[PDB]
Amino acid sequence: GSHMDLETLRARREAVLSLCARHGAVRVRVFGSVARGEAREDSDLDLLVAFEEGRTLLDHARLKLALEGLLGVRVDIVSERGLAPRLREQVLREAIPL
């Protein structure tokens, strides 16, 4: 592992999206500095996803763990729901569909 690069992120981002869709993630977009192409080896990965109906935290953990596994690096997932109204709106402005 290590050496995580945006160019490489797209590699997992593609598979992550496929699995994300399977786990229950429609709003698969990148929000934050990461989406802007900013994130050091000591930074976190902010991802804003929206879980449809039937999806439980179980899937979240599975996705979060799957993300960390595929990315082999810490991955922070956020749910539009738990999110905020003023934050969500702002998050969207950042959220980028890969």
Residue whose C-alpha is closest to residue 20's, from 63, 80, 65, 70: 63
In 10 A of CB 84, how many CB atoms? 10
Token pair 């050496």 is found at 3
What domains are defined for the chain? Answer: 1-98 (3.30.460.10)
Distance separating alpha carbons of residues 27 and 25, to the nearest angstrom: 6
Method of determination?
Answer: NMR
Q: Note whether 33 and 96 are within 8 A (CB).
A: no
Distance separating alpha carbons of residues 95 and 66, to the nearest angstrom: 20
Q: Note whether 17 and 96 are within 8 A (CB).
A: no
